[PDB]
């Protein structure tokens, strides 16, 4: 409580200098490599500029916690709380835009002003609910509070519950789609190899004809995986493959086991030349798209697991415990530093590009 | 060795309904599944090929879908012309094509109970040494009704043949005729001849009988 | 337009032989594999055999293997299904369909164009006329309301028969049932008509059974007892 | 061991609505067909409706079509009959029956006592 007031201006200042420096390097990477910027990137860069705006607002909180009481005016306090609320709402709705963009990209300026502009609307409840109360010998600036409560509840529902269910639907759909695509790809490849071994070790034409049936159904499925020259090299390599299965099913229908096994030995040449080369090409593209989603998943999970308890504490307390207030306050203020940390560990686009900045 | 299992053996719907016919393959057949429509007395017509692509010429109310090895034909809006039989077929290879059991789409109607008449054998037929007794079930919906023959309060089996008229043009009601065939000596050795029917539109079984 | 027609269907004894035809016009047989599909009366479709005129590869179903032989003739653009040792389960309608070759979209359109099919019927019975019997309007059956008459034809072997009522003047209420196949190899049919019982004694009802394979025309009156 | 019980009924205003329920103990409603019949005090046993197995459909008579609606519950092992736009010709005991034949031949043996639905 009173002891906890002593450690947080050291922690918030350390949050301030690392959080300021962490996100300018992101936004100076955004100005040096504008050719490779992306939708997600732009939304992530807007989250970074909201983070350095919060980094500028942090030293006011540092002095206000170091003095033990609020020194500046009420305009400053509701400016600080509105800046924190616009940071939270900007992060939530930019992750909403990222989720929508990645859903419409995988399953299937003028944006940035809208997401920033819409965040002022939901943070307008913070501008009127917060006032400096001089109670119990302490002049502290905390929110306290029928139409205003209805406006707060409607804005809370519309800005939080719809994007959270929208995220937990969309990102699970992305993960399930990517994992089932990899599972279908590997199942088709394992069918094509295992039934080839079955044909090679077979003795009677009943299992040769039955294994080619399973090979033809998997080679027809793997052709649907995929006007480019690489597009013509993929599908024509499967038209040879299914066309060579039909040359062995026709031989196995005549009752020739040894001629069917020799004709299915030529399926190894097409599998090595046309199939295995684009098996690894399609596999490595799926592992890259999984790794990009795993960065976005870690960004969403860090943002909610840090900012949701402080938002629930301030909503419960103002509607109606000393240790949980300062723990939740430093947890949501810690998020300003955790965002460029995640871009430096698993953030492959940021890490390789920032290393080129140090060379230049 | 690849079996297609068309699940609805019969379907009843009115004009404007949306109907769904499902078929299931024994193995994976990729998306090599076609859907055909056959009117009575005519060759089948291709509706859907490659399990989703509607054929060039059929209307756009027909659609297809694939989920694993489960294939689905959907008619969004029924039409008088729609009523017909529909077959699912896998065509994974030239020598491995198999069809489904079929699905007859009928006209939905309010339930009508059959009117049951009994016709004894004539005197002209009795001189030939063979007696046939007819039980007629007139103007009933739905199709599923059963007839049993109780000669001297004893049931019969294997001596009755049933023929059903298909759905009528005007009122769309079926009609059934169960004929029981015996010899001359088998006919004159009994007194009570009855046909008892049960239908879903009948609370009690309807027995029509005579004594000769 | 392009099309396939069929010929050679008809009536043979069991154990006999019959060569069906499938004349394809508008397209060549060297571009399409030709298949023969079978539909029993009252049953579903069943594949029989196919032929690849280009590669010469052919195959049959298990139930027709050894007995059936399919050939192609690109000079006349026809296909032949020679059937030998025709058992009693082979009476059906035979359709001749086409199917494209791998690769591409002609393969994916399976059986796009069909033929009208021919009826092949196998039976040991010979042509005879029907026996016509009166199913009389029994007076106790719904007295005072509406009653039913019938003409039952019992033993005629060739299936298409025609029953008219009162020389075509009676149409409202007549049900002519499909012919069922008896255990003696011949077909039995019934034609019933629902009239109202106030006009039973006044109006007269005569059924006319019309049978051209035997050239038999029977006009039998039906009267209440 | 198969018993059947129905609920609902009573006095309904003209143009009103009702929802009867029928549940059987000792036998599963699923894999079976479930029928609803009428009996007026002066008339014979009339047919109202029938519900088939799952999505096979529901059929009604010529006097209750559109107004009546049958719903099934295989998990709860019961059926519901919803009546809308009532008329004083409907005052009847509503019996509930089980079709023993899976091919819907119409074997009605498991009858019930039924509930009385009267108008005004
Ligand atoms: C903002 C931090 C960082 N951005 C990063 C990611 N973004 C993306 C995440 C997921 N999917 C995409 C995508 O779908 N496609 C099409 C490329 C991304 O772009 C990371 O992962 C990562 O780190 C970055 C990039 C730059 C320069 C390129 C300007 C500077 O900082
Ligand atoms: O003082 C602050 C600090 O910034 C927040 C920002 N939060 C919101 O604007 C909204 C929000 C979302 C989620 C949650 C959660 F708890 F459920 F997670 C709560 C609130 C959209 C309304 C607002 N406040 C107030 C609201 C009353 C003044 C305390
Ligand atoms: C309460 C006060 C301090 C709030 C201040 C909000 C400021 C920092 C916000 C509000 C609108 C924002 C802008 C909205 C849209 C864009 C376009 C984008 O392509 C680059 C960033 C840019 C140009 C944003 C920069 C930051 C911005 C100017």
Domain check: are A46 and A91 in the same one?
Answer: yes
Please name the residue that has the structure tokens 């019980």: D5
Cα within 13 Å of Cα(A256), Cβ side: 13
- Gap between the Cα atoms of A46 and A39, Å rounded: 11
Of C45, C138, C178, the CB nearest to B99: C45
Q: Which helix (H) or strand (E) segment is A353 a member of? A: helix A348-359
Compare all CA atoms of chain A with the CA of C59 and give the residue at the minimum distance. A253
CATH topology of domain B10-107: Immunoglobulin-like (2.60.40)
Classify residue A289: in a domain, yes or no.
no
C138 to B119: CB separation less than 8 angstroms, yes or no: yes
Question: Nearest CA to CA, how far is B69 from chain A (Å)?
Answer: 11
Residue A136, preceding peptide bond in cis (omega within 30° of 0): no
Report CA(A122)–ligand 2 centroid distance (Å).
Answer: 9
Among the bound ligands, the one closest to the CA of A291:
1
**Mutate-to-test residue for ligand 2 from A85, A151, A333, highest number of ligand atoms within 8 A of CB:** A85
Assigned token pair, B76: 């969004």
Cβ contact, residue pair C150, B134, below 8 Å = yes
Could you identify the atom of ligand 1 that is nearest to the CA of residue A102?
14
C36 neighbors C50 (Cβ within 8 angstroms):
yes
Q: Give the CA distances from residue A211 to residues A184, A215, A240, A261, C49, in Å, rounded to whole numbers and listed in that order.
A: 18, 6, 18, 11, 22
Q: Which chain A residue has the Cα nearest residue B2?
A: A213
- How far is Cα B171 from Cα C175, in angstroms, rounded to an integer? 13
Residue A160 lies in a domain: no
- Which of these, B196, B38, C151, lies nearest to D107 by C-alpha position? B196
Q: C34 with C51: CB under 8 angstroms?
A: yes
Spatial CB neighbours of C150, under 8 Å, sequence gap ≥ 6:
B119, B134, B136, C134, C135, C190, C191, C192, C193, C222
The DSSP string of D45-56 is EEEEEEE-SGGG
Residue B58, beta-bridge partner list: B56
Residues after which a C–N gap over 2.5 Å breaks chain C? none
Tokens of A154: 């409607």
Q: Are residues A93 and A206 in the same domain?
A: no
Give φ, ψ of C34 to 5 degrees. Answer: -110, 125
Contact B146, B197 (CB under 8 A): yes
The CATH class of B115-211 is mainly beta
Cβ contact, residue pair C46, B44, below 8 Å: no
Q: How far apart are CA B180 and CA D48, in angstroms?
A: 33
CATH of the domain at A240: 1.20.120.10
Distance (Å, whole) CA A259 – CA A213: 17
Q: How far, CA to CA in Å, does A36 sit from each of A33, A290, A350, B20, B199?
A: 6, 19, 11, 48, 74
Instruction: Give me the architecture of the C132-222 domain, per CATH.
Output: Sandwich (2.60)
H/E stretch holding B67 reads: strand B62-67
* Whole-number Cα distances in Å, B69 to A321, B29, C50, D79: 57, 7, 25, 33
Taking CA atoms only, the protein residue closest to ligand 1 atom 25 is: A350
Beta bridge partner(s), residue C211: C216
Query: Does one domain contain both A45 and A118?
Result: yes
Euclidean distance between CA atoms A99 and A108, whole angstroms? 13
Return the residue whose CA atom lies nearest to atom 17 of ligand 3: A109
Q: B200: which chain D residues are within 8 Å (Cβ-Cβ)?
A: 33, 35, 50, 59, 99, 104-106
The ligand 2 atom at the shortest distance from the C-alpha of residue A122 is: 9
Pocket-testing residue among A34, A52, A113, A122, ligand 3, by greatest number of atoms within 8 A of Cβ? A113
Closest ligand to residue A329's CA: 2
Q: Are residues A40 and A119 in the same domain?
A: yes
> Ligand 2 pocket: which of A50, A119, A122, A156 to mutate (most atoms <8 Å of CB)?
A156
Phi, psi of C81 (to 5 degrees): -115, 100
- Please tell me if the CB atom of residue A87 comes closer than 6 angstroms to any atom of ligand 2: no
- Which residues form the domain of A228? 179-283
Record the resolution, in angstroms: 3.0
Closest C-alpha to D12, from D101, D76, D82: D82
Reduced to 3 states, what is the DSSP secondary structure of residue B130? strand
Q: Any CB–CB contact under 8 A between C33 and chain B?
A: yes
CA dihedral D89, D95, D96, D100 (to 10 degrees): -110
Which residues contact residue B82 at a Cβ distance below 8 angstroms, ignoring those fewer than 6 apart? Answer: B61, B75, B105
For tokens 């009924």, what's the residue?
D9
Q: Regarding beta strands B10-13 and B103-107, do their DSSP bridges make them parallel or antiparallel, or are they unpaired?
A: parallel
Please report the sign of the dihedral spanned by the C-alpha atoms of residue C117, residue C71, residue B94, residue A242.
Answer: negative
**B142 contact D CB<8A:** yes
Partners of A130 in beta bridges: A143
Interchain proximity C177–B164, CB inside 8 Å: yes
CB-based contact (8 Å) between A239 and chain C? yes
Nearest to A188 by CA among A219, A225, A234: A219
The edge-to-edge listing of strands for the beta sheet with D78-84 is D3-6, D17-25, D78-84, D68-73
DSSP letter for each residue of A167-210? HHHHHHHHHHHHHHHHHHHHHHHHHHHHHHHHHHH--SHHHHHH
Which residue among A217, A224, A253 sits closest to B92, beta carbon to beta carbon?
A217
Is the minimum CB–CB distance between C69 and chain B shorter than 8 Å? Answer: no
Q: Are strands C78-84 and D17-25 parallel, antiparallel or unpaired?
A: unpaired
Residue B119 vs residues B115, C138, C199, C205, C220: alpha-carbon distances, Å: 13, 7, 19, 16, 17
Closest atom of ligand 2 to CA, residue A125: 28
Both tokens of A139, joined, read: 């002049």
Place of tokens 């079709």: D99
Any idea what the Cα angle at residue A326 is, between residues A325 and A327, rounded to 5°? 95
Which value, in Å, is the radius of gyration of the alpha carbons in chain C?
24
Give the domain CATH number at A54: 1.20.1070.10
Method used to obtain the model = cryo-EM
Best residue of A183, A210, A217 to probe chain B, by most B CBs closer than 10 Å: A217
Domain boundaries, chain C: 3-122, 132-222
CA distance B120 to B148: 16
- Of A78, A315, A316, A328, which is best to mutate to test ligand 2, by the most ligand atoms within 8 angstroms of its C-beta? A315
Largest Cα–Cα distance of chain A, in whole Å? 99
Atom of ligand 2 nearest to the CA of A315: 29
Q: Is A89 in the pocket of ligand 2 (CB under 6 A)?
A: yes
Instruction: Find residue C1's DSSP bridge partners.
Output: none
Torsion sign over Cα A22, A23, A28, A29: positive
- Domain contains A305: no
Positive or negative, the Cα torsion across A161, A162, A163, A164?
positive
Based on the fold, state whether residues A39 and A129 are members of the same structural domain: yes
Helices and strands in chain D: count of H runs, count of E runs: 0, 10
Same domain, A220 and A330: no
Question: Which helix (H) or strand (E) covers residue B48, if one does?
Answer: strand B45-49
Least CA distance to D57: which residue of chain B? B12
Q: Which of A130, A50, A86 is nearest to A315 (CA)?
A: A130
d(CA C164, CA C178): 14
How many separate domains does chain A show?
A: 2
Dihedral, CA of residue A92, residue A98, residue A102 and residue A105, to nearest 10:
140
Distance between terminal CA atoms of chain D? 38
Q: In a 3-state reduction of DSSP, which class is residue D96?
A: strand
What whole-number distance in Å separates Cα of residue C146 and Cα of residue C199?
9
φ, ψ for residue D115 (rounded to 5)? Answer: -115, 150
* B12 inside 8 A of chain D by CB: yes
State whether A250 and C57 contact (CB < 8 Å): yes
Token code pair at residue C6:
């069929």
Q: Do domains B10-107 and B115-211 have the same CATH topology?
A: yes
One-letter-per-residue 3-state SS of chain C: CCEEEEECCCEECCCCEEEEEEEEECCCCCCCEEEEEEECCCCCEEEEEEECCCCCCEEECCCCCCCEEEEEECCCCEEEEEEECCCHHHCEEEEEEEECCCCCHHHHCECCCCCCCEEEEECCCCCCCCCEEEECCCCCCCCCCEEEEEEEEEEECCCCCEEEECCCCCCCCEEECCCEECCCCCEEEEEEEEEEHHHCCCCCEEEEEEECCCCEEEEEEECCC
CATH pick for D3-100 out of 1.10.10.2120, 2.60.40.10, 3.40.47.10, 1.10.10.10: 2.60.40.10
Q: What three-state secondary structure class fits A60?
A: helix
In the Cβ-directed half-sphere of D101, how many Cα atoms lie within 13 Å? 12
B192-199 and B53-54 beta bridge pairing: unpaired
B200, D106 Cβ separation under 8 angstroms: yes
Cβ atoms of B97 and B57 within 8 Å: the answer is no
CA of B189 from ligand 3 middle (Å) equals 105
Burial B180-200 (b: 16+ CB within 10 A, else e): bbbeeeebeeeeebbbbbbbb
- Burial of C133 (C-beta count, 10 Å sphere; 0-12/13-18/19+): buried
Longest alpha-carbon distance in chain C: 74
What is the Cβ-side half-sphere exposure of residue D69, based on CA atoms within 13 angstroms?
9
Helix (H, G, I), strand (E, B) or coil at A292: helix
What three-state secondary structure class fits D60? strand
Three-state DSSP state, D36:
strand
Closest by alpha carbon to B200, among B110, B108, B104, B105? B110
CATH fold of the domain at C3-122: Immunoglobulin-like (2.60.40)
Question: Is there a contact between A246 and A291 (Cβ–Cβ < 8 Å)?
Answer: no
């Amino acid at each position: 409580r009173q002891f906890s007031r002593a450690f947080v201006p050291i922690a918030y200042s350390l949050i301030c200098v690392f959080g300021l420096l962490g996100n300018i390097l992101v936004v100076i990477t955004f100005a040096f490599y504008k050719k490779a910027r992306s939708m997600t990137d732009v939304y992530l860069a807007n989250m970074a500029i909201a983070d350095i705006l919060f980094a500028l607002t942090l030293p006011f909180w540092a002095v206000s916690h170091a003095t033990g009481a609020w020194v500046f005016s009420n305009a400053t306090c509701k400016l600080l709380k509105g800046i924190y609320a616009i940071n939270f709402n900007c992060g939530m709705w930019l992750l909403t835009c990222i989720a929508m963009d990645r859903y419409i990209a995988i399953v299937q300026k003028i944006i940035c002003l809208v997401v920033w502009g819409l965040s002022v609307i939901i943070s307008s409840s913070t501008f009127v609910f917060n006032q400096k109360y001089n109670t119990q010998g302490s002049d502290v600036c905390e929110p306290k509070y029928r139409w205003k409560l209805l406006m707060l509840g409607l804005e809370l529902l519309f800005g939080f519950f719809i994007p959270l269910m929208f995220m937990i639907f969309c990102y699970t759909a992305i993960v399930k789609t990517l994992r089932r695509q990899l599972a279908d790809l590997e199942d088709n490849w394992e069918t094509l190899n295992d039934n080839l071994k079955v044909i090679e070790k077979a003795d009677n034409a009943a299992q040769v004809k039955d294994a080619l049936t399973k090979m033809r159904a998997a080679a027809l499925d793997a052709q649907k995986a995929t006007d480019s020259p690489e597009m013509k090299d993929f599908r024509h390599g499967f038209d040879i493959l299914v066309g060579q299965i039909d040359d062995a099913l026709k031989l196995a229908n005549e009752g020739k086991v040894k001629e069917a096994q020799a004709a299915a030995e030529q399926l190894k040449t097409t599998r090595n030349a046309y199939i295995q080369k684009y098996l690894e090409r399609a596999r490595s593209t799926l592992q890259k798209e999984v790794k990009a989603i795993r960065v976005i998943i870690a960004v969403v999970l860090v943002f909610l697991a840090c900012q949701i308890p402080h938002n629930m504490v301030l909503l419960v307390t103002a509607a109606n415990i000393a240790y949980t207030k300062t723990v939740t306050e430093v947890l949501a203020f810690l998020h300003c530093c955790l965002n460029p940390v995640l871009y430096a560990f698993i953030g492959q686009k940021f890490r390789n590009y920032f290393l080129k900045i140090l060379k230049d | 060795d690849i079996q297609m299992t068309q699940s609805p053996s019969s379907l009843s719907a009115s004009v404007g309904d949306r109907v769904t016919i499902t078929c299931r393959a024994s193995q994976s057949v990729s998306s090599a599944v076609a859907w055909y429509q056959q009117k009575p007395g005519k060759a089948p017509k291709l509706l859907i090929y490659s399990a989703s692509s509607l054929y060039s010429g059929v209307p756009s109310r027909f659609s297809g879908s694939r989920s694993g090895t489960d294939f689905t034909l959907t008619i969004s809006s029924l039409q008088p012309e729609d009523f017909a039989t529909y077959y699912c077929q896998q065509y994974l290879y030239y020598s491995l094509v198999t069809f489904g059991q079929g699905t007859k789409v009928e006209i939905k109607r309010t339930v009508a109970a059959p009117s049951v008449f009994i016709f004894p054998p004539s005197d002209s037929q009795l001189k030939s040494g063979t007696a046939s007794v007819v039980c007629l079930l007139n103007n009933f919906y739905p199709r599923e009704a059963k007839v049993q023959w109780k000669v001297d309060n004893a049931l019969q089996s294997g001596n009755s043949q049933e023929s059903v008229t298909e759905q009528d043009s005007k009122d769309s009601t079926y009609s059934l005729s169960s004929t029981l065939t015996l010899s001359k000596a088998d006919y004159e050795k009994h007194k009570v001849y009855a046909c008892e029917v049960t239908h879903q539109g009948l609370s009690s079984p309807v027995t029509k009988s005579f004594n000769r | 337009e392009v099309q396939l027609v069929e010929s050679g269907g008809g009536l043979v004894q069991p154990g006999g032989s019959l060569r069906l035809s499938c004349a394809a016009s508008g397209f060549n047989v060297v571009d399409f594999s030709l298949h023969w599909v079978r539909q029993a009366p009252g049953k579903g479709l069943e594949w029989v055999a196919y032929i690849s005129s280009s590669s010469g590869s052919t195959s049959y179903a298990d139930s027709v293997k050894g007995r059936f032989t399919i050939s192609a003739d690109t000079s006349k653009n026809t296909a032949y299904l020679q059937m030998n040792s025709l058992r009693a389960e082979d009476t059906a309608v035979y359709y001749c369909a086409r199917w494209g070759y791998w690769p591409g979209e002609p393969w994916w359109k399976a059986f796009d164009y069909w033929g009208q099919g021919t009826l092949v019927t196998v039976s040991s019975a010979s042509t005879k006329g029907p026996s016509v019997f009166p199913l009389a309007p029994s007076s106790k059956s719904t007295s005072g309301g509406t009653a039913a008459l019938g003409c039952l034809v019992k033993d005629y072997f060739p299936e298409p028969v025609t029953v008219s009522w009162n020389s075509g003047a009676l149409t409202s209420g007549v049900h002519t049932f499909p012919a069922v196949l008896q255990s003696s190899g011949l077909y039995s049919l019934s034609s019933v008509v629902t009239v109202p019982s106030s006009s039973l004694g006044t109006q007269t009802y005569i059924c006319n059974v019309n049978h051209k394979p035997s050239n038999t025309k029977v006009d039998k009156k039906v009267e209440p007892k | 061991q198969v018993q059947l019980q129905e609920s609902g009924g009573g006095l309904v205003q003209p143009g009103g609505s009702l929802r009867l329920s029928c549940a059987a103990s000792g036998r599963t409603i699923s894999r079976y067909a479930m029928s609803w019949f009428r009996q007026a005090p002066g008339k014979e046993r009339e047919f109202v409706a029938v519900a088939r197995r799952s999505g096979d459909g529901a059929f009604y008579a010529d006097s209750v079509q559109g107004r009546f609606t049958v719903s099934r519950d295989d998990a709860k092992n019961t059926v519901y009959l919803q009546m809308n736009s009532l008329k004083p010709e409907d005052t009847a005991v509503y019996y509930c029956a089980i079709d023993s034949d899976t091919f819907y031949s119409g074997s009605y043996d498991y009858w019930g006592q039924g509930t009385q639905v009267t108008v005004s």
